[PDB]
Design a protein around this ligand. Structure first.
Ligand SMILES: *[C@@H]1O[C@H](CO)[C@@H](O[C@@H]2O[C@H](CO)[C@@H](O[C@@H]3O[C@H](CO)[C@@H](O)[C@H](O)[C@H]3NC(C)=O)[C@H](O)[C@H]2NC(C)=O)[C@H](O)[C@H]1NC(C)=O
Ligand SMILES: *[C@@H]1O[C@H](CO)[C@@H](O[C@@H]2O[C@H](CO)[C@@H](O[C@@H]3O[C@H](CO)[C@@H](O)[C@H](O)[C@@H]3O)[C@H](O)[C@H]2NC(C)=O)[C@H](O)[C@H]1NC(C)=O
Ligand SMILES: *[C@@H]1O[C@H](CO)[C@@H](O[C@@H]2O[C@H](CO)[C@@H](O[C@@H]3O[C@H](CO)[C@@H](O)[C@H](O)[C@@H]3O)[C@H](O)[C@H]2NC(C)=O)[C@H](O)[C@H]1NC(C)=O
Ligand SMILES: *[C@@H]1O[C@H](CO)[C@@H](O[C@@H]2O[C@H](CO)[C@@H](O[C@@H]3O[C@H](CO)[C@@H](O)[C@H](O)[C@@H]3O)[C@H](O)[C@H]2NC(C)=O)[C@H](O)[C@H]1NC(C)=O
Ligand SMILES: *[C@@H]1O[C@H](CO)[C@@H](O[C@@H]2O[C@H](CO)[C@@H](O[C@@H]3O[C@H](CO)[C@@H](O)[C@H](O)[C@@H]3O)[C@H](O)[C@H]2NC(C)=O)[C@H](O)[C@H]1NC(C)=O
Ligand SMILES: *[C@@H]1O[C@H](CO)[C@@H](O[C@@H]2O[C@H](CO)[C@@H](O[C@@H]3O[C@H](CO)[C@@H](O)[C@H](O)[C@@H]3O)[C@H](O)[C@H]2NC(C)=O)[C@H](O)[C@H]1NC(C)=O
Ligand SMILES: *[C@@H]1O[C@H](CO)[C@@H](O[C@@H]2O[C@H](CO)[C@@H](O[C@@H]3O[C@H](CO)[C@@H](O)[C@H](O)[C@@H]3O)[C@H](O)[C@H]2NC(C)=O)[C@H](O)[C@H]1NC(C)=O
Ligand SMILES: *[C@@H]1O[C@H](CO)[C@@H](O[C@@H]2O[C@H](CO)[C@@H](O)[C@H](O)[C@H]2NC(C)=O)[C@H](O)[C@H]1NC(C)=O
Ligand SMILES: *[C@@H]1O[C@H](CO)[C@@H](O[C@@H]2O[C@H](CO)[C@@H](O)[C@H](O)[C@H]2NC(C)=O)[C@H](O)[C@H]1NC(C)=O
Ligand SMILES: *[C@@H]1O[C@H](CO)[C@@H](O[C@@H]2O[C@H](CO)[C@@H](O)[C@H](O)[C@H]2NC(C)=O)[C@H](O)[C@H]1NC(C)=O
Ligand SMILES: *[C@@H]1O[C@H](CO)[C@@H](O[C@@H]2O[C@H](CO)[C@@H](O)[C@H](O)[C@H]2NC(C)=O)[C@H](O)[C@H]1NC(C)=O
Ligand SMILES: *[C@@H]1O[C@H](CO)[C@@H](O)[C@H](O)[C@H]1NC(C)=O
Ligand SMILES: *[C@@H]1O[C@H](CO)[C@@H](O)[C@H](O)[C@H]1NC(C)=O
Ligand SMILES: *[C@@H]1O[C@H](CO)[C@@H](O)[C@H](O)[C@H]1NC(C)=O
Lengths: 461, 122, 122, 122
């Protein structure tokens, strides 16, 4: 009686994994092909994006199980390796150093150490005595030292480093991802959507929006803002191992600078290869620091305490310092202009909030700015050493950089005496947690355009 | 693209061409750039080959000459084609699906061999 | 190959098929050879997908059931098909062409559902 | 796959779809897999392009409207379709075949232009 029919082009899909590809914003890259993220090679997104809302569509989402974040983590690591591959190596530089104090007095910062060493010229048999300035975190006193001037680099007992090429620009150019044809990207539109759940408002798109590959820890910088409400995302909310992602509704403007006039010198190493170093400091040395508007930060912390105490009732929240550990883990680390910053952040996370709105003084007018000191490393082993270590070349002149804090990485210090006063600390280290805040919305699916239905419709014969 | 995904099958019977309209158009990055095109070509050619085997290729609606089995049948025609949507219907029609393609293939082969046995003398 | 590129549209109706006969025939050099083969496969598949969208695939000459609009119309039938060649005709139909394909598509879709409106009652 | 290769042509006339149903999609290793998938796509697209040229695509058996030349003819119809198998028959029909392809192409083009001349006055 009834007859099967099959239809081509039906609108059904399925969950799948696939290899995405990059797409820039058709920016004028003809001068800037030397970007470290190699974004010039991507296909330019010419037209308007396919902002196609579906309607009557509900689907479950899980951004903690998303494949996309791991793929783009691998892509960032591979980009770093392929950008750092043809640059100059620093194997001959790992020699015995003789070091003294270049800064006159200990002051408030003196960590610019002077050192001298030997190098190989263009000729193999000609050794040349040379000198350079370094930072105290970069250099390590030599083994079995009699409190001497004998010094070495930090990396030399771990792995060799390569310096970054001077043409390389570390500006975070925005990157779009597009699924291949035959696949699709579904994104959420629900305004209060946390990490998991059914999204009532789902729209398809061919390519994602312009997310940015910002290298930072403990503070999300220049991310996409929360649209109307501060979002708290955590995989369990009761396990301390699950890192809380805090998505702020309003940005907090932060300024960071190195004030002193640094100078750059060059040293010939080997046949046709050069090395760049800090030669001298011009003028009076001053402390590298960052500046944050205190009132806005306090009001933001108050609203975060509101959003957390509505998740944790009858418990005061203590904004405390992060747990002790390494320099790269405790300090807020980032880069701006091509140099790397590590900021102290003790006095930044120093406060508390209970159910009472403690601070109506935010309604009063003030110009209080918290200032926190920062230090500078030349040699880094970030992403836990899975890439080759990069020696950042120094940059002449002063450096200034401005940013928006849009998100926080927090952990719950679940102590035994936290029956009423809960402790939340800065956290970080896993760089994909920076990116899960930006890939919370998107999801990849596979189109399956064949359908089966009966209609009692018989083929002619 | 997918402009009527939540609608009924009768409503999607007008917009079934816009899905197939966009199925083929759109050194670290270069590897993925190659891979996406290879995957898209394979994905299109798969079900194009399947429609070619079933013989109803070149048209979006297939008349099959295969009887619908009663074990597959639970709903009425008006219950399906006016009330039901494609995406949730795919969940319940996921059962028994694997033999339908072979049934269509053998019916198409039987039709072709009967047409040959007719037209060899006719 | 391209043996009637300078002739009229009437003459090319004898040659055109052998043009299609050359549409698929045939470590740095290996990379380039792979790129060439992938490009040829994509280029052959794209317009075949367009022909399948219009529904008149499998044949060289299509009849469309779509009326020619007067805004496109300036020349007569003998003024086109006997006086001049394909190249200048493509040059002058460079305007307005980019919508026409889609019209064919939806027209094709209408035919299918009209066919369904017969074949359910067949 | 190839489940009736030893039989006659009439015996394979109902089993000829099992070949085509598995033709398409049935760092050193990744390079080899990429090469294999590209080769499979090309080899599937080649004869499909040839069938599209001959116009009898979409079906497994083609009636051709081309007369069998006497120079190719040595056996009877019952001598072929009952006594002979495909594999050994390919050895003796290996001659003349490249001419036969072009003859099919030009006859198909003649059929298309005659159908156009009929349907222009339809
Ligand atoms: C950090 O947050 C700031 C707001 O808190 C952002 O500052 C705003 O950026 C907008 C876009 O960059 C500006 O809008 C532009 O304004 C100019 C001048 O009025 C117009 O010509 C442009 O058309 C307009 N563009 C758009 C898309 O609106 C805002 O004027 C600007 N200021 C305010 C007070 O809103 C920062 O951009 C943001 N990021 C950084 C890195 O600081
Ligand atoms: C860091 O330590 C090095 C090592 O001493 C300092 O380099 C020394 O710099 C002084 C002047 O800046 C040099 O003196 C000059 O020597 C030349 C001859 O070489 C002479 O013609 C000049 O009149 C002057 O006397 C000295 O040679 C040089 N030594 C080496 C080994 O390079 C460097 O200045 C120190 N940096 C800071 C910021 O103090
Ligand atoms: C390569 O050389 C460096 C430099 O010595 C080695 O790092 C050193 O590792 C030891 C062992 O963890 C550190 O000692 C620790 O010191 C803290 C106090 O700061 C103390 O609380 C711990 O109990 C422990 O004693 C030492 O500080 C650290 N030095 C530096 C400069 O980081 C490294 O282990 C060597 N790697 C290899 C593979 O040999
Ligand atoms: C997220 O964290 C929660 C904890 O808040 C996990 O849920 C379950 O929590 C209960 C108590 O809240 C745990 O029960 C405990 O069992 C031990 C040993 O039986 C007992 O000594 C304790 O007094 C308490 O009764 C339970 O173990 C825990 N579940 C598991 C599997 O450990 C929850 O599993 C976490 N994960 C998710 C995805 O929710
Ligand atoms: C970030 O900045 C904070 C603020 O200065 C640093 O914490 C401070 O560390 C010093 C150690 O150099 C502490 O001084 C010592 O404290 C002990 C214990 O009370 C005392 O007995 C000693 O005589 C000495 O004063 C200081 O207390 C501590 N806290 C404050 C508020 O200054 C912190 O080390 C910096 N770095 C990181 C990675 O957090
Ligand atoms: C900025 O934020 C901080 C903390 O979020 C606010 O400071 C806090 O103000 C409360 C009272 O308004 C202080 O509570 C008092 O603490 C002492 C400590 O012994 C206790 O004895 C009192 O009974 C009372 O509980 C709290 O300590 C203080 N926290 C800090 C870190 O200073 C501040 O009001 C905010 N300012 C603005 C302008 O928003
Ligand atoms: C090197 O240090 C100097 C001195 O701190 C920096 O100059 C300062 O730059 C900021 C913005 O970059 C200036 O603020 C703005 O100035 C404009 C007028 O120029 C004014 O209309 C704005 O309202 C705002 O105040 C600041 O005035 C300027 N100071 C001086 C003395 O020039 C410079 O940016 C640093 N350069 C680098 C590459 O780090
Ligand atoms: C760099 O090389 C020079 C030699 O080219 C070293 O100077 C020698 O050091 C030893 C050890 O104290 C002395 O016995 C020699 O008299 C020194 N002079 C010469 C000419 O050999 C020097 O120690 C090396 N290192 C640095 C940091 O300068
Ligand atoms: C579902 O999401 C879509 C897109 O996120 C919403 O469409 C936007 O609606 C706002 C006003 O509500 C308009 O200003 C925008 O222009 C719309 N987007 C586009 C691309 O046109 C839609 O409103 C949401 N619906 C619900 C019920 O949440
Ligand atoms: C932030 O956390 C540290 C964690 O060590 C707190 O320091 C402890 O404070 C308790 C208070 O009774 C002492 O008993 C411990 O001995 C302290 N430990 C150390 C290592 O000093 C600190 O008090 C917290 N600060 C705030 C404001 O909550
Ligand atoms: C956290 O903030 C509180 C409040 O400003 C700090 O406590 C003050 O510290 C200064 C520094 O010596 C003292 O002069 C004040 O008397 C302190 N006030 C009170 C009420 O104790 C505290 O030091 C800050 N802690 C950190 C780690 O930054
Ligand atoms: C996220 O929201 C969903 C409903 O929107 C809820 O079921 C789930 O418990 C929430 N999870 C967290 C960690 O807030
Ligand atoms: C918990 O807090 C709410 C409001 O924040 C309050 O109404 C309630 O009384 C508190 N619980 C107890 C046991 O006091
Ligand atoms: C919350 O802390 C403020 C700090 O001044 C205090 O005034 C208020 O009484 C506290 N509220 C509760 C419920 O403890």
């Amino acid at each position: 009686n009834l007859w099967v029919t099959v239809y081509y082009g039906v609108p059904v899909w399925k969950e799948a994994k696939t290899t995405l590809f990059c797409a820039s914003d058709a920016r004028a890259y003809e001068k800037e092909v030397h970007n470290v993220w190699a974004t010039h090679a991507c296909v330019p997104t010419d037209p308007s994006p396919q902002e196609l809302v579906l309607g009557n569509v509900t689907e479950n989402f899980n951004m903690w199980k998303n494949d996309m974040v791991d793929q783009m983590h691998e892509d960032i690591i591979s980009l770093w390796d392929q950008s750092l591959k043809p640059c100059v190596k620093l194997t001959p530089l790992c020699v015995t150093l003789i070091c003294s104090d270049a800064t006159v007095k200990t002051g408030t910062v003196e960590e610019m150490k002077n050192c001298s060493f030997n190098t190989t010229t263009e000729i193999r048999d000609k050794e040349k005595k040379e000198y350079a300035l370094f930072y105290k975190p970069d250099i390590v006193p030599l083994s079995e030292t009699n409190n001497t001037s004998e010094y070495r680099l930090i990396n030399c007992n771990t792995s060799a480093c390569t310096q970054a090429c001077p043409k390389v620009t570390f500006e975070p150019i925005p990157i779009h991802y597009c699924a291949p044809a035959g696949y699709a990207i579904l994104k959420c539109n629900d305004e209060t959507f946390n990490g998991t759940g059914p999204c009532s408002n789902v729209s398809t798109v061919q390519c994602t929006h312009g997310i940015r590959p910002v290298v930072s820890t403990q503070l999300l910088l220049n991310g996409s803002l929360a649209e109307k409400e501060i979002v708290i995302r955590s995989e369990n909310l009761t396990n301390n191992a699950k890192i809380i992602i805090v998505h702020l509704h309003t940005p907090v403007e932060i300024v960071c600078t190195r004030p002193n006039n640094n100078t750059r010198k060059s040293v010939r190493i080997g046949p046709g290869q050069t090395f760049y170093a800090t030669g001298d400091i011009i003028g009076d040395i001053k402390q590298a620091h960052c500046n944050i508007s205190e009132e806005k930060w306090n009001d933001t912390l108050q609203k975060v305490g509101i959003e957390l105490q509505k998740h944790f009732p009858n418990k005061t929240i203590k904004y405390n310092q992060s747990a002790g550990g390494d320099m790269e883990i405790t300090t807020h680390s980032f880069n701006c202009g091509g140099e790397f910053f590590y900021c102290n952040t003790s006095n930044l996370f120093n406060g508390t909030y209970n159910g009472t709105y403690i601070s109506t003084n935010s309604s009063a007018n003030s110009t209080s700015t918290i200032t926190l000191q920062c230090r500078i490393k030349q040699i880094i082993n970030m992403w836990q050493g899975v890439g080759r270590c990069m020696y950042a070349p120094p940059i002449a002149g002063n450096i200034t950089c401005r940013s928006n804090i849009t998100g926080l990485l927090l952990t719950r210090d679940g102590g035994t005496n936290s029956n009423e006063t809960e402790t939340f600390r800065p956290a970080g280290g896993d760089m994909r947690d920076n990116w899960r805040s930006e890939l919370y919305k998107y999801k990849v699916v596979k189109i399956e355009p064949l359908g089966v239905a009966p209609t009692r419709c018989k083929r002619r014969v | 693209f997918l402009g009527a995904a939540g609608s009924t099958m009768g409503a999607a019977s007008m917009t079934l061409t816009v899905q197939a309209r966009n199925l083929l158009s759109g050194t670290v990055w270069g590897i993925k750039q190659l891979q996406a095109r290879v995957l898209a070509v394979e994905r299109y050619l798969r079900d194009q080959q399947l429609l070619g085997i079933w013989g109803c290729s070149g048209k979006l609606i297939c008349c099959t000459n295969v009887p619908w089995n009663s074990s597959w049948s639970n709903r009425n025609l008006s219950e399906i084609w006016d009330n039901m949507t494609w995406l949730q219907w795919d969940k319940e029609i996921s059962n028994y699906t694997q033999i339908i393609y072979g049934l269509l293939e053998e019916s198409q082969n039987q039709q072709e061999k009967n047409e040959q046995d007719l037209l060899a003398l006719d």
